[PDB]
Amino acid sequence: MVYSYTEKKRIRKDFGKRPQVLDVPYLLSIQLDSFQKFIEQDPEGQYGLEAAFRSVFPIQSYSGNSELQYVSYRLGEPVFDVQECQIRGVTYSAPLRVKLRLVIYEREAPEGTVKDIKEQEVYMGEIPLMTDNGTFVINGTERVIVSQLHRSPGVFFDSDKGKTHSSGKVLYNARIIPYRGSWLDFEFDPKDNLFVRIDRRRKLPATIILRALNYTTEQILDLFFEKVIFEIRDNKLQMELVPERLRGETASFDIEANGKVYVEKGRRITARHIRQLEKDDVKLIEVPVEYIAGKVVAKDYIDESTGELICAANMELSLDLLAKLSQSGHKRIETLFTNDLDHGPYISETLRVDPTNDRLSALVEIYRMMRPGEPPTREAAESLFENLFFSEDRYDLSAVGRMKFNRSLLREEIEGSGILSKDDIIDVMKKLIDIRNGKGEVDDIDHLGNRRIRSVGEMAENQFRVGLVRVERAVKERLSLGDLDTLMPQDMINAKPISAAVKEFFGSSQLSQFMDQNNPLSEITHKRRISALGPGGLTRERAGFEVRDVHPTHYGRVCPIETPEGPNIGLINSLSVYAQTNEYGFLETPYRKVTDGVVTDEIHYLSAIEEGNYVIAQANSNLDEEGHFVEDLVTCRSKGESSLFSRDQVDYMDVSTQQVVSVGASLIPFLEHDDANRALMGANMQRQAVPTLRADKPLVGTGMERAVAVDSGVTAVAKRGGVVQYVDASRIVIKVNEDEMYPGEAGIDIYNLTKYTRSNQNTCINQMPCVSLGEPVERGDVLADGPSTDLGELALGQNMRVAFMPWNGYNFEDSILVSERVVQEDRFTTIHIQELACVSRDTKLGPEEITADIPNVGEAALSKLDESGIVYIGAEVTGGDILVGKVTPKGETQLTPEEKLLRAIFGEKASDVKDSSLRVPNGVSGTVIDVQVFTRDGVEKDKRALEIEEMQLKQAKKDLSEELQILEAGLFSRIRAVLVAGGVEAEKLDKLPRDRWLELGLTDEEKQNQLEQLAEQYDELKHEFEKKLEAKRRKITQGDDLAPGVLKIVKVYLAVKRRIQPGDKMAGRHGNKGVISKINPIEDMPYDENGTPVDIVLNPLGVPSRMNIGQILETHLGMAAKGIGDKINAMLKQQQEVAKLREFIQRAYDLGADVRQKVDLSTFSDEEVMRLAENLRKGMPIATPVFDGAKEAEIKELLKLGDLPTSGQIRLYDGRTGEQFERPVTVGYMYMLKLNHLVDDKMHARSTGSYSLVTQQPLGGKAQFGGQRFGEMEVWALEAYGAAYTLQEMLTVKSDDVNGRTKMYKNIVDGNHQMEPGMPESFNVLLKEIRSLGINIELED
Amino acid sequence: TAGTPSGNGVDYQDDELPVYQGETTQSLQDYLMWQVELTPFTDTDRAIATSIVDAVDDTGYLTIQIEDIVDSIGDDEIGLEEVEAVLKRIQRFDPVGVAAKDLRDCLLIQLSQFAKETPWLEEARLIISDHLDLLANHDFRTLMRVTRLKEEVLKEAVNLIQSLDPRPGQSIQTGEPEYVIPDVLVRKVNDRWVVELNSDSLPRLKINQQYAAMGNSARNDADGQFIRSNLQEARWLIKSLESANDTLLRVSRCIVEQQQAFFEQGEEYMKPMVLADIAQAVEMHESTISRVTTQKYLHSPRGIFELKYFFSSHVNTEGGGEASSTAIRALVKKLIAAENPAKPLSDSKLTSMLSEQGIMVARRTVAKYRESLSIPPSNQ
Amino acid sequence: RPLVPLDGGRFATSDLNDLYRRVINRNNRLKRLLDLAAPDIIVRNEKRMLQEAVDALLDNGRRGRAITGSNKRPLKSLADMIKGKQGRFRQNLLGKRVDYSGRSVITVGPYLRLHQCGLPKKMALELFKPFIYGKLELRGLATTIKAAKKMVEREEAVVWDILDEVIREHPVLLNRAPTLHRLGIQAFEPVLIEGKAIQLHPLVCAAYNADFDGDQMAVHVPLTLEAQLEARALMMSTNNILSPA
């Protein structure tokens, strides 16, 4: 109840100090949920394949009265499972079956149909599926897909830092970004002119687009400005009063209110005068005529006498114009505001710049600017403008785009048309003018509320949509030439482009890369990875200093610690433990609701925008029993800041202290005691560890090991756990209990563990059981632990006894000193697996045969080859041994006498057939593990192929017959009970087979009903098992459909053990790394007064400068834990009774200062206590959470419990001199990992090899036997030394002097040591290159 | 595809402007020159060594005569005595026995490099190698009497001789058997033996040509429109490739139509189809069809991988109508192999058997068919 | 300008070959169309085509927004692939790769002198192969070069003895990849050690800016009397003790 079966075997001592509200999520929910939403059926057309089909289908020809109606779709069962798919090297995918019908409409009768062919489902392409762990097995690989962090479609306003024209003038711009389509932009000139940049083309005034929307000059001036009315009647020339707008202005003359002076000429302009004027109800008042001189007419007043009128908008007025309008009777004149206090002159200047005022003129102008080719004919311009924006299939903002668009402009409605209208462009322009005016502010583009996440499902949906559009384009053509005989497969189903697009996206993309397979931690980290790069992302060199900086919005969403170092720092991030993605695609993080002064248990997920308003408390703020805050003033985040608030002003609380760290950074104990960058290095280095031979749990952990181990999927977890029936190194069979059971056919659970298997990084993957026999298990318990996992806990390192002291300079700088005892116990010894393959491929001259006998090959070479030419399993091959014996034919149809006598003396071939055999590459050694020969259909079966097929059939029958045995035993038990009910012969009945001829008939009812039904069920069971067995046999024995050219394939695996050595690299999980300097003998290492030497010696000089106190704290804590473990081991050694041992374990499990763990041994069974105590001989595995855990006092009392000094330092004696070191030395246990950088892959040397055809210089890199590159800086250094002869021998003799190389080699062999230089080939190549142009360059004498 | 191979070894030169650059390979002649450059030779000796190693074939034997080498030198005091010494020095290089004039010399030099105490050194040094080599080619029943030695000793001397390398210098080759078969013409078995074509890449080429040429033309960055600058080159290329694939498919369909029986039941059922037979079928001239189907290759479950192997005009004056000499040769090979241990296989007897079977062929032709790819089993 | 080989006998033309082929095609078509007395419009178009092909061959990426092809990547013209970054960076002007060069991870040796470094014997016996061949042929252990080569291949004990004899006073020079000043490359006297890691004297780490947490070095052999004297009398670690800045 309190603890599960897998946890009662070994309980970590949690230091706690704070309860946990909600548990850590599945840690893999993003990829799983995204692909589930992409794949699963949806009754509505919301998302996925159904959404794409509804987007394109239904489709009809151009008035051809023929349409294809789409109804539902399905995915067929995969033809291979995951394991055999990986072992074969093929893609794991499912066929796509789509059901659609052809309808033929009546030509004579409108809206009538004549035919309706409802043909069955058809096939187009195969959609790859993801495994249970979120991986896409394509081409026999893993190929995880990385999520992308991009800018959400919508509207963004920016100020470009206001430094472009060097005048200090800040420039505002607005951008409209759709999900798919062409961008739109607005910009501000330094002369304050509205300019647009459509599709990033040359800048044009906004007035062309503004007029293209059927907007006249009067209407634009009316909508974009607040027009005022000027009344000139009986020469009074009054003005309407708008005191609200009249804020800043100078009175040109005396201002009187209803004939009484209100404001004098040039009087006070303060708010008091405005308030006094507004208080008095005053009608229109007269003004001096000089004020109207600067005014501009807005409307276009018409003269009632003659058709002539002053329609010149955006123009001032003249003194004669006043008389002209008075003659026409214009009593009221409409003029815009023309006030510059907060508003200003806009839009009008752009209309003055551009004189086009017609929709046709604007359309042709934008057609010329967009397309500088052929001028339009009133149809090209209209159609092109309709295609640019406001087109259903050309321009499209997603629902998130519409949401952001409406929210940024303060519109209540969220949902809306997915295509932009006429009004929103006007609203955007008005908003930009508003920001320029002063009201409003620019938004942050690095704000996490403006950045979205694209997962695998959405990208796959987009690729499928593109492919289906391409298919549709071809489909539309055929319908014009369609008769009634055509069906759906004959209607251009076109699987080719669907499959091509989908496979191109999955197999070859920037965001679909090989997944890391070192540890489960690297797989977990890679799966939940956020990347800013990609197709639609931001490139490395385009990234400024601000996009790769941590933001105050990164709190509970992305980790500020985990990130790559050099190129991609800040561009690749990792999700936090509790972070999850909103419905629209924005990051979220949970918080606890706070009501009054008590924090509640209900949990709300807040995004980046919502959390910006509330006041959020801290996770590590103390609370009372009732939930109230124990102190009045608490620390909170209000708006991107930190300050103290009252106990009542808070609104939310953090769920836990791990909210801001990712999975990788959660496994670092004492993270708060490490420097940020060194902890970054430690977190990045924890993922490069190599799983060892034997797993070893960490003594000082965190408690996240169980979650990482279970959620990664390397282990084997029970799903309907009952009791364990049969155990083996390769199988576990569990008898599911009766309480939960599927009715009928009984049922058992069979788990086939994956033995030694090559991973992506050429490491080893192996699973071994954890249950012994007859041991009851529950659902979710761990049965087998995969690579680097001990009893269901992440264990990717080993517990090393460490002394912090300088030792004769052998730990100088970052080096590490290691004892020989560490080497002897095979710690840090890893298994590496390699795959080698050879293919027999047909040729014109004849087929390629794989045979044991190899011409011109001695008998010693054929010793390790079988009768079929394939190595025996288990043979140890080194150097250049032959693996597969393959012969290539040669062509000769002219039998000359010498070849005739050659054939006479020797075999019929006379060794004409060349040999091309798969040999081990030099420097590679190991034991042959597996051979996986594949053959084509029709070709003769290989001799070993029969043996492998036999073993596969044996395994299938062995794992299939268990359920048959169970079912037949149940049937026999039922028959025995029936015969016991009547006419029981007991042992006499049990002795004869077939229930002693079904116990005759006995009673009529039993014979007619019981015995007959039992016999019928028995026969049906036999027939069912038999058909299933021959189905398995047929599936096993088949000819693999190979490539048209290939004929046979053989794959060979080699496994080798890599031991530790001075060249190897070793590092802890606190950012402290190094290389081994020496493997010291046991008697030379320092020892304490008990004679036990240390295993590792490190330098104290590396602690203070790097600022890692977690190192020392973990060392002390590991020493305390191992002291308690030693006490338990010693007390178990002396055969002490169970009572005292239980008392000691209970005392050790109740330590700490009010921890939240309540483990008690009172309810523990005695055998359970014995097993748990036997599991703590090697140490007590205590756990400290990330930002709360053990303190100095608790560590010291833990030390005092185990009879160890509280200072953490003991007296060491020199193993060489026998003298005691003058000062005490810090000794303890530190968890040390083994990184993937070994000198067996980093040691290289070359004297002579191969050179390129061009420039004749040595090749580069290992596996090609290349030479080290002597770059430009090395030559600069040689020049600065004055070494001219060394430089000359570097440039000519060693690299490019073709004759010089041979001459110098001949001199060296003879012993001359003479140079004889020449002309490098590269200069000749350069001369030929320059001469290949029209330029002549020559070497004059 | 149930089983798919892992990607074959391939690479391309990166971070280097002349992409793919190259990679030097070491051949037999290059290795011989490298060995020559590291031994003390005079200038005349060096010239002779270069001249004689230039003539080394792929198998490691000298193709040109020694007197012809002397004539090639064309200088006095370089008579055959000197070139003989130089060649004999050259022979003892890393592929021991390389640059050998004949088989006898190769065995002599191979046996020379030994402990001089092997059980049958003098037995096969000259009695077997330098003499009665033709006898050793046959059963060598009279060789024991000729050499005055017991047959038991010869039974081990023959094995000792066979222990030597027959063709030294062929273990140095660095070429890779990458001359695999594209099989651009794929074929599967159906109710009518349908024939398809793979590796067309026509949709891919069309898409790439579009996205490049029409992509630049549709792009509005350049002034005007590239309606013919780039758009009207991809169309020409696509049309040419489509026409080529169409005529190839038509020729293949004609070939399978006239040669259905070769693929059905027995393999040796080819009609003697001529170029005019397909020319009239496809209404195209014979020259184009001959140039089209002269190295194109098909992928058949049982038939040969070629498109010219079927094109035979070998009527051979068959009794009933006409026949193909390919089937006649196949039948002769099958019958000759399946015969008595004596295996007479006489040309007259084979011709009589073929005539009885219905193939009216002269006794002199059958000798040519047999000698093309076989030898008479003691028919003389 | 070699053309790339593919699987089978197929050959794929490189970018320069494509440019030359296009220029030749345009020239041939223009020549054949000139003699037909065609209207001047198509003559004008074909002359423009030939000119554009010539500019694309000589200088890609200008006047026509590049030609690209088959991967939506610009084709490499004659000037773009002159030498590395259009200059002389990669395979000329001090960019050469060299023979007699090695590389491995460095560790610390506190027992060393200022002029000594620890050289693995597997890294040796490969850099000093021709010297070992010469010493074997000179001492009479092997007469032919083939015998000496085979004996070195079999790595017998006398081979190790001769290697130790031939390394005696031959200085070797180690450099670290970011060579910032002239002290980033120095000449030491090799000492044969068993293993795979180079043992560097701690006192030169500051000059090298080297630490033992995973760095690597490169080893070059000065195989000439003049080069040996220069490495001993100029670039020895005992020679440079004061920084030249």
Place this chain on the structure above:
DNA sequence: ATGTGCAACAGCATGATCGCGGCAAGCTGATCGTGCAAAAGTCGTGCCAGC
């Protein structure tokens, strides 16, 4: 008092942006038909020399 010459400002195109090393991954193709003489090449057939 109006017209002409010269210096300055804004816009546009061009060139460059540290090394060294190890996994990796895709292949970058082809082309065209012509219908005919003119040539070279090839096959069914009969010959003499060796056993």
Place this chain on the structure above:
RNA sequence: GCCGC
């Protein structure tokens, strides 16, 4: 491209 210095 990923990683190491």
